[PDB]
RNA sequence: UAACAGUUUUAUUAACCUCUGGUUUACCUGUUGUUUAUGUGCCUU
RNA sequence: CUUGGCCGUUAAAUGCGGUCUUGCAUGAAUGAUGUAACGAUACAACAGCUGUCUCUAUGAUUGACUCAGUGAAAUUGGAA
RNA sequence: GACAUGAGUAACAAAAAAGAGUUUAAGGUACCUAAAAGGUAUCUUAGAGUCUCGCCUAAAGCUUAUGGCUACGUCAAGUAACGGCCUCUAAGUUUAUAAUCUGAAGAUUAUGACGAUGAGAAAACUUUGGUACCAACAUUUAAAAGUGAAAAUUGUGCAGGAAGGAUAAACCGUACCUAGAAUCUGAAACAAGUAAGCUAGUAGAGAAUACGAAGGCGUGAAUGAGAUAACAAUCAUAAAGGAACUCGGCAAACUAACUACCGUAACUUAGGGAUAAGGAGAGCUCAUUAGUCUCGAACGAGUAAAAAGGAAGAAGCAUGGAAUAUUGUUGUACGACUGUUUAAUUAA
RNA sequence: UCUUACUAUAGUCAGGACUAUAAAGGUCCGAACGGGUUAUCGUUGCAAAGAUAUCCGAAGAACUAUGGUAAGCGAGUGAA
């Protein structure tokens, strides 16, 4: 009868909700990736992008605001205002990426997603595009406009860009990661 | 209704009140044994 | 404005029942739904009950136009209008009023 | 319940519009060729790539 | 607040190497203490004979060790020397049929009790640093961090091997301020003579190597009176 | 100690074993005289 | 917003000091500045009105905020009234204190004739 | 001609938040007790 | 009989308190009668206080609702 | 007895709470590879653990009982650091003996035997009746001080406070569970109930209230993930009014605790009423200091000493700052009063 | 082995206040403990008597533990 909800309450109390989001962002900056539900990945995203904006700011207030979101500031503040600040110094927003996956827990079947930091060491979309380009060059296939588009997305703001992307494709072909991949030209002749 | 009348029940009272010796040593207890023995009970007491 | 499933108080203005003088789980309930066997042994059609509210057409008549600006493209009318911001509304001359002067109907057409 | 529900009416409640809907939003993984869900990541490539980035680095 | 160390190589103040991590030996990390200079530090403010003998008792079943200055142990030693290692693992009392004397350290000078009270302190401090701050066993040796909290609590109760290594270190000058040293400051320093009595000849082999100032003997005084025969290797 | 009467200013921590545990490898509360020494490794049973 | 059992401060020289509302004359909604009511005198000041008398009164100022045409809003710290008769003219001869300016368009010229301050 | 000033009430139905209020459980500020982490931290030669 | 008569309390008193008596059908250890103190006893009044109410509104959690897992009961002559 | 219906519905909601990594064993799938294998990833079943967050905390912790359909490698001459068995007896019991009574069965008195919920030498080595007594209450006492016991000393009150015996190491118990997370009783894996000791610290008069160190927990999928409609439960706030609600101020709100503070009525059995009513004060900084304490050398200095202290001062909307203690007064009936009662609809 | 009464042996009642007492009170405020005043929830309940809040006693005619005795023609026990 009242107002529409401002945000997801995630079937939790106020204190629990705030703590849960702080943990999701504390593990994201510590591990650069987290595999959780889609609703939690989307709520922790808005708090993670606002925490990375605090690192870019040079005020003392920004440093106290970041200390009040992380759960181990003594260990993660150097990384926040260090490596991460340098990474997203030229990126105007959109510092995170949510990608849907299969249910992390088969009992619940709850829709799940991966929340990653773009241009990070564990960027999933950067590795999926390299595996595609690896399968193309190994099968003499022409990359689609959607593969080339993603190739520019994951190499525009990166430190070295294309160089770091070609080494991934080369290493994936060195270990035969694309062994057993079905050629796209044989997809229409498969019912299973 | 039924009540939890066996709460805090000690096994010392079971032997005193329903034990074998409470019966072989009394006139009315010899009947219980003889009755329970005629029926074929294995548990004559306690 | 839509309001989803509404009770009997918001939808039909029912007063509700007591709050503390013994009331048992029936503070915002609708009470009796009708009479007994003599009344039909049924709930009569048109009985006011909970249900969805809002998200329906509504007309407000006899609203003057205070300002008319072509550049901004706005037509300021007195009073309130149904719906949310950004929703499309229909504006037409009042039916319960006399049509605008003949000179105006011709000037605009001209 | 005043009476037992007949076989006709209980079958109506269980089958009228309760048919399990087929999943047609299926495409194939680009680097894998395996069938995945639309707009979702390949579960086979995820675990593999997620494990490949743990050894090299 | 607590501060746990890491299993990293460090320098030792003892003559021999206590652990494979020890960097150097016989390192002077601080100026000599007042009693270290003295040739004969006497029993200034302690009872007559106190300190000349130090006893060590152990649980012959679970390996729990307790140090004592007297030939016996009391309920105090159990409460003050045994940390909580889990449920059903801390005995509510001392059972006479489980606790036996592990060893006994006797110094040469039977009147320099101050040396024993120091050896007793380093031993209790080493023990507290074995039950806590066991970074050298988390991923190596017994690998306590790979075990369950139940099995971990039973391995932390077993301090008898560690204790017999703490003696070889404390008696070799391990620790800071260990009065087992004797600085001349004419600067030459040496270790004080000591004797260790063992109820089991095999127990003394937990220490990879012993110093050159310790004498090993079989049988602890008073145990033969209880009809408890010592264990000898050579038979 | 300067002031010895029972009501003197108490500036010590009366919780001796604060944050101290063996199962969680908390570490010693204070710096002991043997705190900078490598733990002696015995020979297993 | 004056309603049943509301206590008011009579600022008229009629004898009453604190009156209790007993009825809202001429409407169902709660009475505001310029509405008639029936009160019961509960206190006096010392043919004046004695404690327990039933008279008609007019709300001259209320503690509830009052919106006006020009957007100006007036709030008073207390609720006050002036006793009148069934005819409509005041019982007293003088009014002490400020009164609401809403008495103008509600046909209360007699009450404003002796109103020293209007707010 | 201009300028200035004045041109009902009650009840009920519905819509609507410009105004006047109420609400505000991931907003700002102040503040008590206690705990935890980090930083810092006494005199003297 | 009865909402007994009068007085006080309420804007309004079948209530409550005081008082008078003809008390259907009060009464003295089936005790009579009057105070102090006492009471989660019963009745009445005052002040304060409040969403009890005029007249409800918003906000919070758990259920309610949907997906996945497990899986009852009263009841039922037969039923288009 | 089997199988239907309700129904794949209700329910798996003690207002503690979860999040992200890691890993072991067995087995199922996919790919690599076709020399079987192995490897990589994933899933199922049964576990373990790390970081973070939270809940309990004079417990939901630890040590033990009553008890046990949880499981059997649980180890003692005795004291420190232990109970039983054994000795002695209480309340009582007695198909023991004698005497007596008695339709039979049996009952009574005496003695004996048995009977703990009590009493039992020594040890960190050991084998008479106030000249009193060991009920309650109070006090004193292991000499640096304080605190908590033990035992004893002294005294108080009336309600006047056991019995008996003495004074080279067998046998039995020892595992786990203690009820918020797998064990006791409640028909059960039940929001109930059950004995003893211990039960960090800050802060307090305190076992009150709040926080919580360690420990434990945040259930055996007996659940998990979403959404945040009506309505229900449990709460929070609220314009103006303030009982207009209602059988009735039901419920809720107001009030509240503290001080060696001020003040306190009718009436009274002279004890009370009374903590009546009604007011004042409170935290932080600071002037000031007789003694005690500390430091330096009588004196000087110090609150990195406890306290005292004033009409001092600062900041804020607010200094009983958060939590904890639920209004005051008046007239009657009944019963003096404190108590007791229909275990589980009547507490009067 | 529940429960009522009695009996023997034992145990428990933070702290504070008033009163003639250091200790003499079916004294006062209030935890543990013991009760169960009022309301709500619940009613195939967590529970065949529970939950939350509120309220009462809390040095006594108190509460609790382990044993013992008294019950079914006549009625044991009963502040009834
Ligand atoms: K019908
Ligand atoms: K508004
Ligand atoms: K359900
Ligand atoms: K408490
Ligand atoms: K024994
Ligand atoms: K006979
Ligand atoms: K419990
Ligand atoms: K009430
Ligand atoms: K009772
Ligand atoms: K009391
Ligand atoms: Mg849920
Ligand atoms: Mg909170
Ligand atoms: Mg019964
Ligand atoms: Mg019992
Ligand atoms: Mg909408
Ligand atoms: Mg209502
Ligand atoms: Mg209700
Ligand atoms: Mg019909
Ligand atoms: Mg045990
Ligand atoms: Mg607006
Ligand atoms: Mg915030
Ligand atoms: Mg008579
Ligand atoms: Mg389902
Ligand atoms: Mg249904
Ligand atoms: Mg339903
Ligand atoms: Mg496998
Ligand atoms: Mg005997
Ligand atoms: Mg006994
Ligand atoms: Mg059970
Ligand atoms: Mg339970
Ligand atoms: Mg437990
Ligand atoms: Mg959980
Ligand atoms: Mg209000
Ligand atoms: Mg108000
Ligand atoms: Mg009324
Ligand atoms: Mg009415
Ligand atoms: Mg100010
Ligand atoms: Mg009475
Ligand atoms: Mg009473
Ligand atoms: Mg009853
Ligand atoms: Mg009752
Ligand atoms: Mg009392
Ligand atoms: Mg119901
Ligand atoms: Mg009382
Ligand atoms: Zn793939």
Residue numbers in the entry:
A (entry chain L): 2 to 193
B (entry chain Y): 95 to 140
C (entry chain C): 221 to 330
D (entry chain W): 66 to 122
E (entry chain d): 33 to 218, 243 to 291
F (entry chain T): 44 to 88
G (entry chain I): 1 to 46, 59 to 131
List sentences from the manuscript:
After subtracting the signals outside the tRNA binding sites, followed by focused 3D classifications, we obtained three distinct classes with tRNAs occupying P-site (P/P), E site (E/E), and in the hybrid P/E state, at the overall resolutions of 3.05, 3.10, and 2.99 Å, respectively. After peptide transfer occurs, the ribosomal subunits move relative to each other, which is represented by our P/E hybrid structure. In the rotated conformation, the L1 stalk moves to a closed conformation toward the deacylated tRNA in the P/E hybrid state. The bases A2381 (G2168) and C2348 (G2112) of the stalk rRNA stack on the elbow of the P/E tRNA. Unlike in bacteria, uL1m does not interact with the P/E tRNA, instead the domain II of uL1m changes its conformation to form a mitoribsome-specific interaction with H82-ES6 in the CP in the rotated state. Therefore, the subunit rotation is synchronized with the L1 stalk movement during tRNA translocation. The terminal adenosine of the P/E tRNA inserts between the conserved G2873 (G2421) and A2874 (C2422) at the E site. The anticodon arm of the tRNA remains located in the P site forming the codon-anticodon base pairing with the mRNA resulting in distorted conformation to swing the acceptor arm into the E site. The disordered N-terminal extension of mS29 gets structured in the rotated state and interacts with the minor groove of the anticodon stem of the P/E tRNA, suggesting mitochondria-specific regulation. The long C-terminal helix of mL108 reaches down to the mtSSU, applying an additional stabilization of the L1 stalk.
Protein synthesis in mitochondria supports bioenergetics of eukaryotic cells and is executed by dedicated mitoribosomes. To provide a representative reference for studying protein synthesis in the mitochondria of fungi, and to reveal how the mitoribosome functions in coordination with its translation partners, we determined structures of the translating mitoribosome from the representative fungal model organism Neurospora crassa. The fungal mito-ribosome consists of 78 different proteins, 23S and 16S rRNAs. Forty-eight bacterial orthologs are extended, and 30 proteins are mitochondria-specific.
